[PDB]
Amino acid sequence: CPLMVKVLDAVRGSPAINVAVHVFRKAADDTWEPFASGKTSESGELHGLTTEEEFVEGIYKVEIDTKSYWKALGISPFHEHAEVVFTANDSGPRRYTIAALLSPYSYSTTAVVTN
Amino acid sequence: CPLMVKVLDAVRGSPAINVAVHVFRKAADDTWEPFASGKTSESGELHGLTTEEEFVEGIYKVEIDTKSYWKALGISPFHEHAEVVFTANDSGPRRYTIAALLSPYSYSTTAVVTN
Amino acid sequence: CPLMVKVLDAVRGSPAINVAVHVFRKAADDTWEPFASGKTSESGELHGLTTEEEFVEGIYKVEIDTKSYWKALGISPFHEHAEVVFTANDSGPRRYTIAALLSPYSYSTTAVVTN
Amino acid sequence: CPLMVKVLDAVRGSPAINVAVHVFRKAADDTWEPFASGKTSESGELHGLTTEEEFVEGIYKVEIDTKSYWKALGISPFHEHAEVVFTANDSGPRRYTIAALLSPYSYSTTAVVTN
Numbered sequence A, B, C, D: 001c002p003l004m005v006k007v008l009d010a011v012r013g014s015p016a017i018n019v020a021v022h023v024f025r026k027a028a029d030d031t032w033e034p035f036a037s038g039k040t041s042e043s044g045e046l047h048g049l050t051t052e053e054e055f056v057e058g059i060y061k062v063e064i065d066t067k068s069y070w071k072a073l074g075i076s077p078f079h080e081h082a083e084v085v086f087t088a089n090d091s092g093p094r095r096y097t098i099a100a101l102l103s104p105y106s107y108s109t110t111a112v113v114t115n
Helices: A066-072 B066-072 C066-072 D066-072
Strands: A003-009 A020-026 A032-039 A058-064 A079-088 A095-103 A106-114 B003-009 B020-026 B032-039 B058-064 B079-088 B095-103 B106-114 C003-009 C020-026 C032-039 C058-064 C079-088 C095-103 C106-114 D003-009 D020-026 D032-039 D058-064 D079-088 D095-103 D106-114
Touching: A003 A058, A066 A079, A066 A095, A079 A095, A079 A106, B003 B058, B066 B079, B066 B095, B079 B095, B079 B106, C003 C058, C066 C079, C066 C095, C079 C095, C079 C106, D003 D058, D066 D079, D066 D095, D079 D095, D079 D106
Parallel strands: A003 A095, B003 B095, C003 C095, D003 D095
Antiparallel strands: A020 A032, A020 A058, A058 A079, A079 B079, A095 A106, A106 B106, B020 B032, B020 B058, B058 B079, B095 B106, C020 C032, C020 C058, C058 C079, C079 D079, C095 C106, C106 D106, D020 D032, D020 D058, D058 D079, D095 D106
């Protein structure tokens, strides 16, 4: 599992469940090609997006659909979504955990990269 | 100015100076059209991006060039840039400050919306 | 002022107003002696805590009363308060801004130290 | 495992290993009684601090020794330590994960509480 996404809710102090996540890869023509998608589970984690074979070097965009998450809780948040853009595997294959901590008008995102 | 950007450096405990910022507006065809740009000052702030007249309701994207910032400091960063995407609304407060706190492998962004 | 405190509300996207702040200095016997206190203004800032003369080198604790802040808003919080503990040094920059970003179950704090 | 501590390094994008953690409980006499201690492992996690039986209702303080961590990496950071203070188990037993994200001049801390 080379790419995992974990999302927490800073208002409730709980995992953020059922959060939609769309991943894109920058193509040779400079456009964003859809790469993988899924939704977080009860643990706030999204596993199985891709495989080591498919996850080649490139620039990736992880789009976390925070607006839909907050709206379902009765909240009108600031951001449309949280976007996380990074080059992956340029020094060989690595495992990436993309974490996000959500509040209605703020979010943080962190990458944990292991070899 | 209705839209301001403020950036801090979490490693040095200082304003993040000379950080390039590009603002885009979502067009009818869903593409991003350049709207405004600038570099943060010695105070880490970017003022004068737009005007009350030009800043109409719509979806905007604020792109913070964090990769170049860390590169200039000789520190290996994770993200290509920090992206802040939001809808501007005439209802609530009229002043938007997009704040960002930067670390090499993590960043936080907050919208401070006031009158 | 050599020491300023600035607090933001991550839920409302606004300055955190009327937040009580207590500053302590570490005494010879290792106990915390009250040093200065105040409430954040409508801008979320607390100025005038101390003076250049009084703010000598030493270890200080800045206590931010986050529990009462959330309580007043009818929102259940996790922490009793946010504590910021640091050593004041004559060497580096002389102005200390203790920034804090508050959510009910999470907070971030950053020291912006400048001239 | 009712109380776990997890620490990440925002500069390296990795778990923060060998970080000392001291936990205290507020006594009936208003003083901080030492409750448990340990150090984070290779995963940046600290397990086995206490048991459900020992972890009764009370106000707890989790002190994370961030200064020593940064110093070992050649960095002189701002904070002496990160303190996390909270009431636990006032509505019956819960499981608490205390997370911290470290940068030299900034840190965030989040609580994930489950039943």
